[PDB]
Design a protein around this motif. Structure first.
Motif, PDB file in Angstrom:
ATOM      1  N   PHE A   1     -10.494  19.969   7.753  1.00  0.00           N
ATOM      2  CA  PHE A   1      -9.512  20.008   6.680  1.00  0.00           C
ATOM      3  C   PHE A   1      -9.877  19.057   5.549  1.00  0.00           C
ATOM      4  N   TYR A   2      -9.592  19.501   4.331  1.00  0.00           N
ATOM      5  CA  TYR A   2      -9.747  18.657   3.156  1.00  0.00           C
ATOM      6  C   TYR A   2      -8.827  17.439   3.217  1.00  0.00           C
ATOM      7  N   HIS A   3      -7.584  17.627   3.658  1.00  0.00           N
ATOM      8  CA  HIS A   3      -6.569  16.583   3.620  1.00  0.00           C
ATOM      9  C   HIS A   3      -6.386  15.924   4.979  1.00  0.00           C
ATOM     10  N   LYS A   4      -6.282  14.590   4.957  1.00  0.00           N
ATOM     11  CA  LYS A   4      -6.018  13.842   6.182  1.00  0.00           C
ATOM     12  C   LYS A   4      -4.727  14.298   6.850  1.00  0.00           C
ATOM     13  N   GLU A   5      -3.790  14.832   6.067  1.00  0.00           N
ATOM     14  CA  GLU A   5      -2.498  15.249   6.598  1.00  0.00           C
ATOM     15  C   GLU A   5      -2.606  16.401   7.593  1.00  0.00           C
ATOM     16  N   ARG A   6      -3.705  17.162   7.565  1.00  0.00           N
ATOM     17  CA  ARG A   6      -3.932  18.219   8.540  1.00  0.00           C
ATOM     18  C   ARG A   6      -5.099  17.933   9.473  1.00  0.00           C
ATOM     19  N   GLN A   7      -5.900  16.893   9.208  1.00  0.00           N
ATOM     20  CA  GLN A   7      -7.086  16.654  10.029  1.00  0.00           C
ATOM     21  C   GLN A   7      -6.736  16.391  11.491  1.00  0.00           C
ATOM     22  N   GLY A   8      -5.549  15.850  11.761  1.00  0.00           N
ATOM     23  CA  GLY A   8      -5.140  15.616  13.136  1.00  0.00           C
ATOM     24  C   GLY A   8      -4.890  16.871  13.950  1.00  0.00           C
ATOM     25  N   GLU A   9      -4.824  18.041  13.306  1.00  0.00           N
ATOM     26  CA  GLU A   9      -4.700  19.298  14.041  1.00  0.00           C
ATOM     27  C   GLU A   9      -6.012  19.687  14.701  1.00  0.00           C
ATOM     28  N   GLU A  10      -7.133  19.214  14.153  1.00  0.00           N
ATOM     29  CA  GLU A  10      -8.461  19.646  14.593  1.00  0.00           C
ATOM     30  C   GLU A  10      -8.693  19.493  16.091  1.00  0.00           C
ATOM     31  N   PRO A  11      -8.412  18.341  16.723  1.00  0.00           N
ATOM     32  CA  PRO A  11      -8.645  18.247  18.174  1.00  0.00           C
ATOM     33  C   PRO A  11      -7.823  19.233  18.980  1.00  0.00           C
ATOM     34  N   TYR A  12      -6.598  19.527  18.541  1.00  0.00           N
ATOM     35  CA  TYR A  12      -5.760  20.457  19.291  1.00  0.00           C
ATOM     36  C   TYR A  12      -6.279  21.883  19.183  1.00  0.00           C
ATOM     37  N   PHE A  13      -6.685  22.306  17.983  1.00  0.00           N
ATOM     38  CA  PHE A  13      -7.273  23.636  17.855  1.00  0.00           C
ATOM     39  C   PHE A  13      -8.591  23.728  18.613  1.00  0.00           C
ATOM     40  N   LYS A  14      -9.432  22.691  18.515  1.00  0.00           N
ATOM     41  CA  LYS A  14     -10.696  22.693  19.245  1.00  0.00           C
ATOM     42  C   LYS A  14     -10.468  22.881  20.738  1.00  0.00           C
ATOM     43  N   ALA A  15      -9.484  22.174  21.297  1.00  0.00           N
ATOM     44  CA  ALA A  15      -9.200  22.306  22.722  1.00  0.00           C
ATOM     45  C   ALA A  15      -8.776  23.726  23.077  1.00  0.00           C
ATOM     46  N   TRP A  16      -7.949  24.358  22.236  1.00  0.00           N
ATOM     47  CA  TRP A  16      -7.551  25.738  22.504  1.00  0.00           C
ATOM     48  C   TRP A  16      -8.761  26.663  22.508  1.00  0.00           C
ATOM     49  N   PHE A  17      -9.629  26.539  21.502  1.00  0.00           N
ATOM     50  CA  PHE A  17     -10.805  27.404  21.448  1.00  0.00           C
ATOM     51  C   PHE A  17     -11.688  27.216  22.676  1.00  0.00           C
ATOM     52  N   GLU A  18     -11.913  25.964  23.084  1.00  0.00           N
ATOM     53  CA  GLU A  18     -12.751  25.696  24.251  1.00  0.00           C
ATOM     54  C   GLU A  18     -12.115  26.224  25.531  1.00  0.00           C
ATOM     55  N   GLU A  19     -10.799  26.035  25.684  1.00  0.00           N
ATOM     56  CA  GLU A  19     -10.103  26.497  26.882  1.00  0.00           C
ATOM     57  C   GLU A  19     -10.119  28.012  26.997  1.00  0.00           C
ATOM     58  N   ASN A  20     -10.229  28.714  25.871  1.00  0.00           N
ATOM     59  CA  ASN A  20     -10.163  30.166  25.851  1.00  0.00           C
ATOM     60  C   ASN A  20     -11.533  30.823  25.706  1.00  0.00           C
ATOM     61  N   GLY A  21     -12.604  30.078  25.960  1.00  0.00           N
ATOM     62  CA  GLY A  21     -13.917  30.659  26.150  1.00  0.00           C
ATOM     63  C   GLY A  21     -14.778  30.790  24.918  1.00  0.00           C
ATOM     64  N   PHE A  22     -14.375  30.210  23.791  1.00  0.00           N
ATOM     65  CA  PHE A  22     -15.165  30.314  22.575  1.00  0.00           C
ATOM     66  C   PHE A  22     -16.236  29.236  22.527  1.00  0.00           C
ATOM     67  N   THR A  23     -17.332  29.555  21.849  1.00  0.00           N
ATOM     68  CA  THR A  23     -18.369  28.586  21.528  1.00  0.00           C
ATOM     69  C   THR A  23     -18.093  28.042  20.129  1.00  0.00           C
ATOM     70  N   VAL A  24     -17.930  26.727  20.016  1.00  0.00           N
ATOM     71  CA  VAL A  24     -17.404  26.098  18.808  1.00  0.00           C
ATOM     72  C   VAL A  24     -18.536  25.465  18.008  1.00  0.00           C
ATOM     73  N   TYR A  25     -18.599  25.795  16.725  1.00  0.00           N
ATOM     74  CA  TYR A  25     -19.471  25.147  15.760  1.00  0.00           C
ATOM     75  C   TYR A  25     -18.632  24.193  14.923  1.00  0.00           C
ATOM     76  N   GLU A  26     -19.192  23.028  14.608  1.00  0.00           N
ATOM     77  CA  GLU A  26     -18.469  22.001  13.872  1.00  0.00           C
ATOM     78  C   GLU A  26     -19.268  21.581  12.651  1.00  0.00           C
ATOM     79  N   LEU A  27     -18.587  21.481  11.524  1.00  0.00           N
ATOM     80  CA  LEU A  27     -19.214  21.067  10.289  1.00  0.00           C
ATOM     81  C   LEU A  27     -19.332  19.553  10.230  1.00  0.00           C
ATOM     82  N   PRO A  28     -20.220  19.045   9.382  1.00  0.00           N
ATOM     83  CA  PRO A  28     -20.212  17.609   9.093  1.00  0.00           C
ATOM     84  C   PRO A  28     -18.824  17.169   8.649  1.00  0.00           C
ATOM     85  N   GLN A  29     -18.456  15.947   9.043  1.00  0.00           N
ATOM     86  CA  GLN A  29     -17.105  15.450   8.804  1.00  0.00           C
ATOM     87  C   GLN A  29     -16.747  15.401   7.326  1.00  0.00           C
ATOM     88  N   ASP A  30     -17.736  15.321   6.439  1.00  0.00           N
ATOM     89  CA  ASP A  30     -17.493  15.222   5.007  1.00  0.00           C
ATOM     90  C   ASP A  30     -17.544  16.570   4.297  1.00  0.00           C
TER      91      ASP A  30
END
Ligand SMILES: NCCC[C@H](N)C(=O)O
Length: 273
Positions: free
Chosen positions: A83-112
């Motif tokens: 996310f561009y804004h810190k106000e939504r960046q805290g959602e990232e770990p929760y969405f990542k966990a859902w994707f991993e738990e449901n069998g997806f292979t996750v690609y992650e961008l550089p933090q910036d």
């Protein structure tokens, strides 16, 4: 085959900050009880058309209801949003966990390097390419990462109106080759790029009155299109193109700058030859 859509209920939903123009003046103006009722009606309407999976919402991240921004899905792969804004960046770990738990292979961008998922990048429904917005949230420089990770042509489109700050607020690929969109949200070059690929008979062009009610923020499953309130003019154009329109009220989510499409993420995106 099966169509599955990810949603996230408004247990902790509020307008707590201002990161797009729709949120201005709306802090604590949402009714959580009305938002629950509106979300439940949307959930039921979508579930009549597709399977709906849910991710548990996190307290302190009210925009987690807007699952379109969790990431970009193709096949078994997801590019996680940064996310561009810190106000939504805290959602990232929760969405990542859902994707991993449901069998997806996750690609992650550089933090910036911001990129806001399917809300900012929508496939052509025949799978010919990915339309990817930039200009307010996702960075143009993220587009080559997505092209390589997902092995897709990316057609970049530049957003120029702060009200239409995610691609999905002004642009909606549909079945049957049709495209529902608001041309003034895009610069001249981007409009020419759209026009080169989608001929006039396949364009469903919205006027500003419908655009500001989030008409383009529509959920399309086969011939069904689900959205917030739109004009009879637009409903008749959609009916002529073969679509069955279902409207459901989403005023409490428009206070945060999102509507039906933003509240959903299609997690079954087949790879098509
Ligand atoms: N796609 C809708 C996202 C809405 C949210 N308040 C945001 O500004 O990201």
């Amino acid at each position: 085959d099966d169509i599955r859509i990810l949603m996230c209920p408004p247990d902790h939903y509020d307008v707590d900050y201002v990161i797009n123009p729709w949120m201005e003046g709306n802090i604590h103006k949402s009714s959580q009880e009305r938002a629950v009722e509106q979300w439940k009606k949307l959930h039921q309407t979508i579930k009549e058309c597709a399977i709906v999976d849910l991710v548990k919402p996190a307290k302190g991240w009210p925009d987690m209801v807007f699952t379109a921004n969790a990431g970009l899905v193709l096949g078994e792969n997801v590019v996680l949003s940064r996310f561009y804004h810190k106000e939504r960046q805290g959602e990232e770990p929760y969405f990542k966990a859902w994707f991993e738990e449901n069998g997806f292979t996750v690609y992650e961008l550089p933090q910036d390097l911001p990129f806001e998922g399917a809300g900012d990048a929508l496939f052509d429904r025949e799978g010919r390419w990915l339309w990817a917005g930039y200009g307010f949230r996702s960075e143009l420089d993220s587009h080559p990462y997505i092209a390589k990770w997902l092995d897709t042509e990316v057609v970049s489109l530049r957003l120029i109106d702060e009200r239409f700050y995610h691609l999905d607020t002004c642009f909606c690929p549909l079945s049957g080759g049709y495209l529902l969109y608001y041309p003034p949200a895009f610069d001249a070059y981007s409009n020419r790029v759209i026009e080169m690929r989608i001929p006039p008979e396949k364009r469903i062009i919205v006027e500003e009155l419908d655009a500001v009610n989030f008409a383009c923020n529509a959920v399309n499953v086969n011939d069904i299109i689900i959205m917030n309130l739109v004009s009879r003019t637009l409903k008749e154009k959609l009916a002529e193109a073969g679509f069955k329109v279902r409207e459901t009220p989403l005023t409490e989510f428009l206070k945060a700058g999102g509507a039906a499409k933003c509240l959903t993420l299609r997690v079954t995106e087949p790879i098509l030859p």
